[PDB]
Design a protein around this ligand. Structure first.
Ligand SMILES: *[C@@H]1O[C@H](CO)[C@@H](O[C@@H]2O[C@H](CO)[C@@H](O[C@@H]3O[C@H](CO)[C@@H](O)[C@H](O[C@H]4O[C@H](CO)[C@@H](O)[C@H](O)[C@@H]4O)[C@@H]3O)[C@H](O)[C@H]2NC(C)=O)[C@H](O)[C@H]1NC(C)=O
Ligand SMILES: *[C@@H]1O[C@H](CO)[C@@H](O[C@@H]2O[C@H](CO)[C@@H](O[C@@H]3O[C@H](CO)[C@@H](O)[C@H](O[C@H]4O[C@H](CO)[C@@H](O)[C@H](O)[C@@H]4O)[C@@H]3O)[C@H](O)[C@H]2NC(C)=O)[C@H](O)[C@H]1NC(C)=O
Ligand SMILES: *[C@@H]1O[C@H](CO)[C@@H](O[C@@H]2O[C@H](CO)[C@@H](O[C@@H]3O[C@H](CO)[C@@H](O)[C@H](O)[C@@H]3O)[C@H](O)[C@H]2NC(C)=O)[C@H](O)[C@H]1NC(C)=O
Ligand SMILES: *[C@@H]1O[C@H](CO)[C@@H](O[C@@H]2O[C@H](CO)[C@@H](O[C@@H]3O[C@H](CO)[C@@H](O)[C@H](O)[C@@H]3O)[C@H](O)[C@H]2NC(C)=O)[C@H](O)[C@H]1NC(C)=O
Ligand SMILES: N[C@@H](CCC(=O)N[C@@H](COP(=O)(O)N[C@@H](CCC(=O)O)C(=O)O)C(=O)O)C(=O)O
Ligand SMILES: N[C@@H](CCC(=O)N[C@@H](COP(=O)(O)N[C@@H](CCC(=O)O)C(=O)O)C(=O)O)C(=O)O
Ligand SMILES: *[C@@H]1O[C@H](CO)[C@@H](O[C@@H]2O[C@H](CO)[C@@H](O)[C@H](O)[C@H]2NC(C)=O)[C@H](O)[C@H]1NC(C)=O
Ligand SMILES: *[C@@H]1O[C@H](CO)[C@@H](O[C@@H]2O[C@H](CO)[C@@H](O)[C@H](O)[C@H]2NC(C)=O)[C@H](O)[C@H]1NC(C)=O
Ligand SMILES: *[C@@H]1O[C@H](CO)[C@@H](O[C@@H]2O[C@H](CO)[C@@H](O)[C@H](O)[C@H]2NC(C)=O)[C@H](O)[C@H]1NC(C)=O
Ligand SMILES: *[C@@H]1O[C@H](CO)[C@@H](O[C@@H]2O[C@H](CO)[C@@H](O)[C@H](O)[C@H]2NC(C)=O)[C@H](O)[C@H]1NC(C)=O
Ligand SMILES: *[C@@H]1O[C@H](CO)[C@@H](O[C@@H]2O[C@H](CO)[C@@H](O)[C@H](O)[C@H]2NC(C)=O)[C@H](O)[C@H]1NC(C)=O
Ligand SMILES: *[C@@H]1O[C@H](CO)[C@@H](O[C@@H]2O[C@H](CO)[C@@H](O)[C@H](O)[C@H]2NC(C)=O)[C@H](O)[C@H]1NC(C)=O
Ligand SMILES: *[C@@H]1O[C@H](CO)[C@@H](O)[C@H](O)[C@H]1NC(C)=O
Ligand SMILES: *[C@@H]1O[C@H](CO)[C@@H](O)[C@H](O)[C@H]1NC(C)=O
Ligand SMILES: *[C@@H]1O[C@H](CO)[C@@H](O)[C@H](O)[C@H]1NC(C)=O
Ligand SMILES: *[C@@H]1O[C@H](CO)[C@@H](O)[C@H](O)[C@H]1NC(C)=O
Ligand SMILES: [Ca+2]
Ligand SMILES: [Ca+2]
Ligand SMILES: [Cl-]
Ligand SMILES: [Cl-]
Ligand SMILES: [Zn+2]
Ligand SMILES: [Zn+2]
Ligand SMILES: [Zn+2]
Ligand SMILES: [Zn+2]
Lengths: 694, 694
């Protein structure tokens, strides 16, 4: 039989291992020859594996690279202008890789050039609330200062935006052992902790879903018109550079000015964590000087696009996509995910060679330039938006398969909750002490839902990965799954080696998943989800699960507004319409579910599958969210304070955020009411797509 | 048999006559009780006629009305401030209607209030080129002047925009007998010409597709958040009032300053048509004073929405819509169209009662507040945009069935050219001297295509009617047809009584269509088009017709750019990508047509019908056109200079328009190139929706 069980049994841990090894022997930085060579390899193998068609789709996008002959670094400089301390020019390479070429040195992609000098201010995680605390409570002014911030908690792009708006003239990012060094584990190569010389690479853009900075709206093809750099989307206006904790220590140890406001501001280094500005007493005339010479350059990138044509509905697309470009070796990010995709394609291809085809078309994608701002997936979606809008059933992401070895983590649209619960009940738990138990059981035990007993936690989608254009811009039901750490122990990284040279095949094989069983489990979840989305006669979406969460999010946003009862009275701010729309959605969804259970008629079916498919689509507002035209989903957007986190009813949330500080409360509360209207309308309009069609 | 012939034979001229009489005995001004009563009547009759469901959909939108107790008028005022001449407070009512209540006096809907005084400047038709001629060639400055303009040539809203941007402080619109009085025909009631006391009502908004001024983007429902008036879309900033030619004569006869620049500026009144500013010699101290006291008020409007559920594809909608509100009696505009819709519904209903149903769902609409800016159709489409976007096959408009008695006029998407040619070959010509000949023959003889021998003229869609939201905003294939005048004789109105109290049932019955045969022919064309769109197994769209016109429009825009060869060389402006995209569209469309001819498989069919349906949709850009976010179709938009006319490749056209006057040619030519890119991309993307889907 050709069924999901045949698909799943064909997946092998040993294949995933072989592929991960294959993909991580040299760096595959976006826009480099080696990543083009890997693209061509993946293309050839996917064809070998049996896909109907496998093409490269290329774009010429803005990327950023250090200058090979004019290295970036930071100094402490004395009154005479002698540089008395310099940060490192590279991470000491790991054992056996000390002769590997083309390791990009740590840098912040898209930093402008500059050599600003000044006094340091320490800003904790550089979150919105850290700057509130500095400026409002401590009366510390960041204007004209170089800010130093620890990585963690939020997307580093948001940190840089926040520092810019505080008037900083430069930003230094560092990894604090409080956040990147787990107690009682050794530094790489002897354990999975970040060494003092390790540094986290990463882009610092604020694209808000735009894709390539030069071509928002349109693919960056051969004849594209490009914005000038001064009009580019999302570029930071001040120099930024990342360093490890050995170097950070040397920068922080001399810090003077105000004490940290409380212990949530202290990391684990042996320094006071003084906020500054500037150094204590004897060193008060010393400054910090940055030297950034990176350049932005339009560079060719290559996605691999594989197609397995559907037997019955070839014009319905289920997409499995994840990126292939890495900062250095990408042992976890992304190749632990890409090796899984490779095995999934191989398995589907084995069935295809035996005469099977899925009901709907499956598209497989190896995205490029994800690390520079989701550029590959976003340009390809801009190119193909009309096909995706009208034909796209679902998008399943496939970045890092592991960030820990503790339990499953899934983030997806509510439309896939039921699919995920059912599939995980049919898979074996890989966990020690759950042998012979289902993945659902182990997951639910380790990561219980906060709302319901006997259910597992499933989170909303945030962003900072390649599902962003499919979900937040285009409104295609999207999901992701991976193995993760125990977030109950502490909220620190389950992979501190993230974006460092130490993130290697050996890291994975020695410390995370020596038997590749977590990778195999993740291949079964991602692969199984794609199998069911592509093969189930009725799309495996339960619209009733959206109704339950919509009520949750409405209760939540209402409770935020209710902190301001006087203003709600004064400006007649009512959530009645939103609750009414949510009630209607619940009633209509329930009736639709009954018809879906109760109808041999392929037009009714397809009509009903179209209503299922276009339901996520109905939450798209073509006017987008305020000043974020590429975030169009009215229920979910990336948090304006942290691109990685999702926010529910983002339009209302942002209108309410910090509202007591607005200088014109009438105007601010007007805008709250406007967003309530937009949300109520969109929920009601989505509900009505599920009514009888005539 | 239940076939198109049974549908068509059931339509009766005598029924259309009875319905027109019924709909035109009292005024049906938008937002008034009488128009609500007519809505309820139409709703009841449509149910009687056999529709499955007939509902009112209501909205609360900004409308505008004169003040009943503080009438609008214009004066000539002397040095002492004595008003020595006053324009009329009402049109003398026609025979037998001298006791009819609630005739709205002539006014310009949405004029602000004011009583500006000043010197007159005569600006011809107040077109873009008329203001160029005044300001650039004649050196006449309109700033602080009251402008007087003759109606004709362009939408009156554009005139007012142009006058505002010239710095006018008020606008007087008048009907010149050159444009509204055909030689050798008598004035109403003795012929169809405009009498000296007749006045053209009409809104003067510049909505650019927004719909209700207060709620752009969202339907104006019960909980809608409204903009404040100062942020409303499209309202004029200076007072405007319309007058007849008796009054115009009194205002123009004293005009001094410069002679008219040439004879294209002279109308037919016995006056010099001096441009001004101000009066000659003896009257140089006299001024013109406007008194406008109209008020804008949020008012309830009602669309009637009738549904005839499809037997096989109930989730595919073919819409027949036209408005019901009129300025006064609406003898032509809109009731000559609405009586036709009524008979069409009656006919479809007769078949339904005998057991027939169309394959796809047919929606019938009686739109309200069309005359105040397409408000009814636009709010309903904003409410239902997700259903329309994913399910809308075609929209057929049904305003005025006649504007002349000479030949057919059709404006539609190229996707319907073939349908229109085939249908009109199967209909009988109503024309004297073509008895026993087809409508195609008489039409093609009287209105030959400029490009092809033996084909009739079919024009592109402009705007200024209810298809605008369906076509230019949402991208649903749209068309319209009516009987028209001989545009070869002269380009003057074929109905000069437009929007005047004289536009009555008797006007139609006595002077246009005493046998109602032109109305019947138009019912057969509109009804037949709806029948075929709703019943043909394969959607009756020929994508190859789009390829032919795209090449025409590309040649055209290229020839406009080529007037500037030096700049094209300097800025490297190439149309290569646009022609390449048009070539690709032609090749792909041709291959698609072959498959469409060459495939018992309902999924292939429906897949192919979806490709046909979504083809018009593929020309939508979700970012819209520059500063016109509700005009999203990249091939067609209403002309920025004349809402009634369509413009092809509007984005490129507007970037090129008057480019030699731009102060920064580098920037202007950059923007031309950007629009070329957007157009090439969109054409290629549309083409790719017709490729094999996997
Ligand atoms: C959830 O679904 C329900 C349908 O079950 C839907 O209920 C609808 O609510 C609207 C808005 O409140 C109702 O609108 C009314 O319609 C009648 C005509 O049917 C009008 O006469 C009403 O207007 C009068 O009263 C107003 C309110 O006091 C006055 O402001 C106004 O000036 C008039 O005096 C009013 O417009 C509508 O009839 C129901 N539809 C039903 C019951 O079928 C509800 O809107 C949905 N929720 C959302 C958010 O869409
Ligand atoms: C109409 O359809 C045709 C398909 O029949 C389509 O042709 C495509 O044109 C593009 C853009 O010109 C071609 O792009 C090339 O692709 C190759 C790889 O296949 C690249 O090596 C090329 O880049 C090199 O050369 C460039 C041009 O001189 C340099 O600028 C560049 O730096 C590189 O050196 C180039 O990107 C594409 O291969 C064809 N596809 C085919 C033939 O299948 C055409 O684009 C369509 N028209 C529109 C408007 O879309
Ligand atoms: C996840 O698994 C659950 C449990 O199997 C699925 O729900 C079950 O779905 C079936 C098939 O539609 C339902 O059966 C129906 O029962 C009614 C009679 O009560 C009948 O009208 C139908 O003909 C049909 O037999 C079953 O009730 C339902 N069980 C529940 C809700 O407890 C669920 O659909 C799966 N989720 C997916 C596939 O996304
Ligand atoms: C308008 O009318 C014309 C003329 O009838 C329609 O074109 C005709 O459409 C038919 C049906 O598809 C074509 O027949 C096909 O012929 C080929 C063999 O050459 C064969 O492969 C098919 O099985 C089928 O019999 C016919 O060729 C075609 N005639 C033309 C183009 O001259 C046209 O489709 C109508 N337009 C509409 C309905 O929008
Ligand atoms: N362990 C790390 C975080 C690891 C993580 O959560 N990564 C994100 C982001 O993955 P990514 O690195 O592939 N995405 C890029 C680019 C994101 C963007 O530009 O939107 C990034 O975040 O730099 C994810 O897995 O989705 C830490 O604690 O700092
Ligand atoms: N005979 C007239 C023109 C008659 C005409 O072309 N009317 C247009 C506009 O029809 P309408 O009057 O129903 N549309 C309204 C509202 C249009 C708008 O607000 O976009 C208007 O033009 O005032 C059409 O039939 O589409 C004349 O020469 O001035
Ligand atoms: C990763 O695996 C691929 C596929 O087996 C290897 O590429 C092949 O290398 C052999 C021997 O050099 C060639 O003959 C083949 O033509 C290659 N095939 C393809 C499809 O490219 C590649 O060498 C492996 N890389 C590493 C680092 O082990
Ligand atoms: C990277 O830095 C190098 C080396 O400092 C730059 O090369 C210099 O550029 C100037 C003119 O711009 C020349 O006069 C120098 O002689 C060059 N120096 C050397 C050592 O080659 C180079 O411009 C930078 N590269 C990029 C891409 O910006
Ligand atoms: C940090 O790096 C800088 C730059 O390489 C060093 O300063 C340079 O030292 C050389 C050799 O002594 C001088 O000729 C250059 O003029 C200096 N450059 C600058 C920009 O000052 C500095 O010595 C290093 N400091 C430490 C402690 O290693
Ligand atoms: C237009 O026609 C309608 C429909 O026949 C007339 O309305 C009807 O009037 C009769 C007699 O007054 C009533 O008993 C019916 O209840 C009405 N029917 C409906 C559906 O409204 C209307 O009177 C006619 N109007 C004019 C001006 O002739
Ligand atoms: C229309 O005009 C009337 C009549 O001139 C306005 O009514 C007057 O309003 C003022 C205060 O605004 C009163 O003190 C006067 O006594 C009213 N005069 C009369 C004769 O009633 C009225 O405001 C206007 N209507 C609208 C809707 O604007
Ligand atoms: C034009 O209309 C105005 C306004 O009605 C007339 O001027 C008014 O005349 C009355 C009665 O004589 C005066 O008491 C008012 O004060 C005047 N109003 C204004 C605004 O001036 C005027 O007589 C009319 N002119 C003609 C030629 O009919
Ligand atoms: C911060 O610093 C600069 C002085 O260099 C000043 O212009 C700016 O307004 C200051 N802001 C506050 C809030 O003190
Ligand atoms: C793997 O699992 C063990 C057992 O809980 C744990 O102690 C170890 O830290 C895990 N490895 C990683 C990288 O999390
Ligand atoms: C037109 O008139 C006013 C003078 O009242 C002036 O301010 C404006 O700039 C003038 N424009 C031109 C082009 O002369
Ligand atoms: C009706 O047709 C006749 C014959 O051409 C023409 O003379 C007359 O002007 C037409 N009526 C109208 C209103 O156009
Ligand atoms: Ca782009
Ligand atoms: Ca609206
Ligand atoms: Cl992922
Ligand atoms: Cl029409
Ligand atoms: Zn990464
Ligand atoms: Zn990644
Ligand atoms: Zn009209
Ligand atoms: Zn009309």
């Amino acid at each position: 039989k050709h069924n999901m069980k045949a698909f799943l049994d064909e997946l092998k841990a040993e294949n995933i291992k072989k592929f991960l090894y294959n993909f991580t022997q040299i760096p595959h930085l976006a826009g480099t020859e080696q990543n083009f060579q890997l693209a061509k390899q993946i293309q050839s193998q996917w064809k070998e594996f049996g896909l109907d068609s496998v093409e490269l789709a290329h774009y010429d996008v803005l990327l950023s690279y250090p200058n090979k002959t004019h290295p970036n670094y930071i100094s402490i400089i004395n009154e005479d202008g002698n540089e008395i301390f310099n940060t490192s020019l590279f991470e000491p390479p790991p054992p056996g890789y000390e002769n590997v070429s083309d390791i990009v040195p740590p840098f912040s992609a898209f930093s402008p050039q500059g050599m600003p000098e000044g006094d340091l201010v320490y800003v904790n995680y550089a979150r919105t609330e850290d700057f509130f605390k500095l400026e409002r409570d401590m009366k510390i002014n960041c204007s004209g200062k170089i800010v130093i911030a620890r990585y963690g908690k939020v997307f580093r792009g948001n940190k840089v935006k926040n520092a810019q708006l505080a008037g900083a003239k430069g930003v230094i990012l560092y990894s604090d052992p409080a956040d990147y060094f787990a107690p009682g584990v050794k530094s790489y190569p002897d354990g999975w902790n970040l060494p003092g010389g390790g540094v986290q690479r990463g882009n610092i853009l604020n694209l808000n879903g735009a894709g390539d900075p030069l071509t928002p709206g349109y693919p960056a093809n051969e004849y594209a018109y490009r914005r000038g750099i001064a009009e580019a989307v999302g570029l930071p206006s001040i120099p930024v550079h990342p360093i490890g904790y050995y170097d950070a220590q040397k920068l922080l140890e001399k810090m003077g000015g105000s004490a940290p406001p409380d212990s949530s501001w202290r990391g684990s280094l042996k320094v006071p964590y003084n906020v500054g500005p500037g150094f204590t007493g004897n060193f008060s005339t010393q400054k910090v000087k940055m030297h950034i010479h990176s350049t932005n350059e339009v560079t060719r990138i290559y996605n691999v696009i594989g197609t397995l044509r559907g037997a019955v509905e070839p014009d319905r697309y289920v997409i499995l996509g994840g990126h292939r470009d890495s900062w250095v070796f990408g042992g976890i990010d992304p190749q632990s995910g890409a090796a899984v995709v490779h095995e999934i394609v191989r398995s589907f291809g084995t069935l295809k060679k035996e005469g099977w085809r899925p009901r709907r078309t499956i598209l497989f994608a190896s995205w490029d330039a994800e690390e520079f701002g989701l550029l590959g997936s976003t340009e390809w979606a801009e190119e193909n938006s009309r096909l995706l809008q009208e034909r796209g059933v679902a998008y399943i992401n496939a970045d890092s398969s592991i960030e820990g070895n503790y339990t499953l983590r899934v983030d997806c649209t509510p439309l896939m909750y039921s699919l995920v619960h059912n599939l995980t009940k049919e898979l074996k738990s890989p966990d020690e002490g759950f042998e012979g138990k289902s993945l659902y059981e182990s997951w639910t035990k380790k990561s219980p839902s906060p709302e319901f007993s006997g259910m597992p936690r499933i989170s909303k989608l945030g962003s900072g990965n390649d599902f962003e254009v499919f979900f937040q811009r285009l409104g295609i039901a999207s999901g992701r799954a991976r193995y993760t750490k125990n977030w109950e122990t502490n909220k620190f990284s389950g992979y501190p080696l993230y974006h460092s040279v130490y993130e290697t095949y050996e890291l994975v094989e020695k410390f995370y998943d020596p038997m590749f069983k977590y990778h195999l489990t993740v291949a079964q979840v991602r692969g199984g989800m794609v199998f069911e989305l592509a093969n189930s006669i009725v799309l495996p979406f339960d619209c009733r699960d959206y109704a339950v969460v919509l009520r949750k999010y409405a209760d939540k946003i209402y409770s935020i507004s209710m902190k301001h009862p006087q203003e709600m009275k004064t400006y007649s701010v009512s959530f009645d319409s939103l609750f009414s729309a949510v009630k209607n959605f619940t009633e209509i969804a329930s009736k639709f579910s009954e018809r879906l259970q109760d109808f041999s008629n392929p037009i009714v079916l397809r009509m009903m599958n179209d209503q299922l498919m276009f339901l996520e689509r109905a939450f798209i507002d073509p006017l987008g969210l305020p000043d974020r035209p590429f975030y169009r989903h009215v229920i979910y957007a990336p948090s304006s304070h942290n691109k990685y986190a999702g926010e529910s009813f983002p339009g209302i949330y942002d209108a309410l955020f910090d509202i007591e500080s607005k200088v014109d409360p009438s105007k601010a509360w007007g805008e709250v009411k406007r967003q309530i209207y937009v949300a109520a309308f969109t929920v009601q309009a989505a509900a009505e797509t599920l009514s009888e069609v005539a």
